[PDB]
Amino acid sequence: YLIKFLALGDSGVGKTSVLYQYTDGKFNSKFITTVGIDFREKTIYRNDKRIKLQLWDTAGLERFRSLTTAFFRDAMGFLLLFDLTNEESFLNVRNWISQLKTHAYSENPDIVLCGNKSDLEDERVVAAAEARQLAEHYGIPYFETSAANGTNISQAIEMLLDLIMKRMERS
Amino acid sequence: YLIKFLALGDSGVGKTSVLYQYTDGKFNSKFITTVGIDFREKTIYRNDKRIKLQLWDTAGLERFRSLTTAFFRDAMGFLLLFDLTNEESFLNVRNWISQLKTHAYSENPDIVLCGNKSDLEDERVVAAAEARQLAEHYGIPYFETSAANGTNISQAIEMLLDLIMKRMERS
Amino acid sequence: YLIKFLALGDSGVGKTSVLYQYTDGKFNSKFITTVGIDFREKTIYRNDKRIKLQLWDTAGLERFRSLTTAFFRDAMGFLLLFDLTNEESFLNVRNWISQLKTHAYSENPDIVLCGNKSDLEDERVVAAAEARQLAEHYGIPYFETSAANGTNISQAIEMLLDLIMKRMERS
Amino acid sequence: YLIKFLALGDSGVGKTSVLYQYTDGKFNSKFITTVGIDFREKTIYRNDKRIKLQLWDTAGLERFRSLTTAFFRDAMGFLLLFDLTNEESFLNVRNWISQLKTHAYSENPDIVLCGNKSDLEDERVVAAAEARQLAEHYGIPYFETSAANGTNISQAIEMLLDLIMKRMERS
Ligand SMILES: Nc1nc2c(ncn2[C@@H]2O[C@H](COP(=O)(O)OP(=O)(O)NP(=O)(O)O)[C@@H](O)[C@H]2O)c(=O)[nH]1
Ligand SMILES: Nc1nc2c(ncn2[C@@H]2O[C@H](COP(=O)(O)OP(=O)(O)NP(=O)(O)O)[C@@H](O)[C@H]2O)c(=O)[nH]1
Ligand SMILES: Nc1nc2c(ncn2[C@@H]2O[C@H](COP(=O)(O)OP(=O)(O)NP(=O)(O)O)[C@@H](O)[C@H]2O)c(=O)[nH]1
Ligand SMILES: Nc1nc2c(ncn2[C@@H]2O[C@H](COP(=O)(O)OP(=O)(O)NP(=O)(O)O)[C@@H](O)[C@H]2O)c(=O)[nH]1
Ligand SMILES: [Mg+2]
Ligand SMILES: [Mg+2]
Ligand SMILES: [Mg+2]
Ligand SMILES: [Mg+2]
């Protein structure tokens, strides 16, 4: 009931800003383009249970992440993000979901897709339906998040917790 | 009938621009000198068959590529490029073809050499015969490509597909 | 009686400046933000014995340190530092002490926490009690060090030497 | 009778300029501070034999070199350089020779120490005797080299060839 999952996606998505909105309920706009392999942890109570939630952050400038073979290997669920203000990030989601399924333990591992930076209404480039459709072909939940607003952040992470808690219970 | 091969060579050759000309039939002149380990995938029909072609790109600033021991190890053919406007790139091809043969699975693995940036007629430095000769000593196909024009791009990749499809069939 | 330990913590703490104050008894204010994996060595006489002390320095821009699986794996004690003039460094100590216990050999390995840059009285941000309290919850020694002054440097390293010498003797 | 050795030392020593003086008998003053893991090869005739000499270059900004566990592991001799115009480089030689002996195959592996940049007479900082003394305590050959002049370059590499050829013959 230590629960570990991994946040991943492209550089600029906002997976550092997103974990901090959840862990600490506020928004640091300052963030070095991550070089290392950090994590924030925090105790949650969901289904009247003990959850030491361990939120592992990754460097956006590699898919060598999930080649960690311990950090990725030890993780139980994945939180794939993209930026709703660059298409490139969104288009890679297929390649991400793909490489997860292959290099992961289970054939179908527990994933939640977030389209971040939703507050940037004026720079939106990914259309919501197309996103929802991509969520359909894979049958994984989708949330339009903002680490600036907090919109759907808690929902999104709580879903991933609920998914793997189900997986844990099914066993 | 998922087919994986790896594009490699020196930094500036144009192996990112070349995969995008093939995948998407156009030319992005913008490309950050690759830091990560990306790939584009795409479904092709060659010999009335299902081809999920997986085009793996590498960072030009290492031969630590092919030390990937999974990414290189899992790949079935190699697409070695050089720039026809710097000799250094061309001269390394021997050292590349060399280190492939050694660190690869088969004694003779399936390779296609491309001399890229052929549109840069005014800055050409490698002479075509010398290139063809180098292709001779190793008995691997050679194409003078441009990611700007698309010239010989499709031909070149289709050849590499045809080679490993032959290898697959021979087994 | 070659003794190896590893200095680690965040970028800017002063673990390069601290090893040099100890090895060489003076202060180089010049220090490139470490890119490699250096060490200083030096022969010491503690409990009337031969000590080839090997002081391994790490790059502050990773927890991929302690994933070294030889450099970290071969080390016998750890010297965790933080800067008393940025809270972030101090707050990570928990996450450091945590990840050490997990990825290390022994359940409880030999650690000494240093709060560096104590000379920067005017920019002090971590309160001494809170630091001492953090040392309490884990039961590991704590020193307020300066690589500029030398204050508590020798004490701190000599303690870590004494701890693992005890561990060696107990075996 | 493929012979592999590895050139290593600190960033700025001149181990890229030195291999090129040997391979090609001239001096490129232009050299990006190496990021990757290159090698030059060349066929030599020493003791009336076939030598495919493989000269592996390393990035100066790590001792993670010799952690390559294939590139270092596959190498048969080592060519340690330092700059005669910075003491730091020279002082590390002990730590280099040390870490070689430990992480290498044989207890005493085949090493040749070069003090490079000897042409920079006006900026010389390491005194020749002190260098020769350091060579004495370890009993490995020493040459004062210049990649600018070619002075002692061929001698130095030919010695390392002769050493490991002896080791090969003794077996
Ligand atoms: N306005 C706004 N900016 C955001 C949002 N999420 C992230 N950012 C901003 O996007 C930039 C990078 O986000 P960051 O938190 O570094 O994301 P990351 O995906 O962890 N970066 P990397 O992949 O390089 O490690 C910063 O400028 C950050 O403030 C968001 O929802 N809204
Ligand atoms: N004119 C022209 N420019 C080209 C061609 N191919 C690549 N380029 C240009 O060459 C530069 C580098 O191309 P790029 O694809 O990044 O090369 P790379 O070898 O993939 N780089 P890296 O190894 O770092 O991944 C870019 O400015 C790109 O437009 C070509 O056929 N013609
Ligand atoms: N005033 C003061 N400056 C210090 C002290 N210790 C380190 N510094 C300064 O802190 C800066 C970085 O210190 P350094 O030793 O390089 O830090 P590091 O923890 O080794 N960094 P990295 O993790 O990037 O290798 C340098 O400017 C150095 O002078 C100290 O005790 N007092
Ligand atoms: N005058 C002079 N300059 C030299 C000599 N050897 C190398 N240099 C110069 O020193 C600089 C760096 O040398 P280089 O060969 O790149 O060394 P390196 O050790 O491979 N560097 P890295 O560790 O970053 O890979 C360049 O300006 C090069 O021209 C020499 O004998 N004399
Ligand atoms: Mg980040
Ligand atoms: Mg590229
Ligand atoms: Mg440092
Ligand atoms: Mg170099």
Numbering used by the authors:
A (entry chain D), B (entry chain C), C (entry chain A), D (entry chain B): 8 to 178
Passage from the reporting paper:
Rab27a is a small GTPase belonging to the large family of Ras-related in brain (Rab) proteins. Rab27a is part of the secretory pathway involved in the transport of melanosomes and the secretion of vesicles containing insulin, histamine, chemokines, matrix metalloproteases (MMPs) and exosomes. In humans, Rab27a is overexpressed in multiple types of cancer, including breast, lung, pancreatic and liver cancers. Evidence supporting the role of human Rab27a (hRab27a) in multiple cancer types suggests that the inhibition of this GTPase could be a target for cancer therapy.
Point mutations in hRab27a were made based on the crystal packing of mouse Rab3, the highest identity hRab27a homologue with known structure. This led to a construct, referred to as hRab27aMut, that is able to form crystals that diffract to a maximum resolution of 2.82 Å and with the potential ligand-binding sites exposed. Inspection of the X-ray data showed that these crystals were highly anisotropic, the native Patterson function indicated strong translational non­crystallographic symmetry (tNCS) and a high copy number was predicted per asymmetric unit. To avoid these potential problems, the systematically weakest reflections with the largest relative errors were omitted from the molecular-replacement calculations. Most residues in all 16 molecules were modelled, apart from flexible residues at the N-terminus of the construct. Residues with poor side-chain density (930 out of a total of 2736 in the model) were truncated at the Cβ atom. The final refinement used a pruned data set from which reflections conveying less than 0.05 bits of information (24% of the data set) were removed. In the Rab27a structure, the SF4 pocket, formed by the α3–β5 loop (a highly variable region among Ras superfamily members) and the C-terminal region of the α5 helix, is of particular interest, as it is fundamental to the interaction of Rab27a with the WF motif of Slp2a.
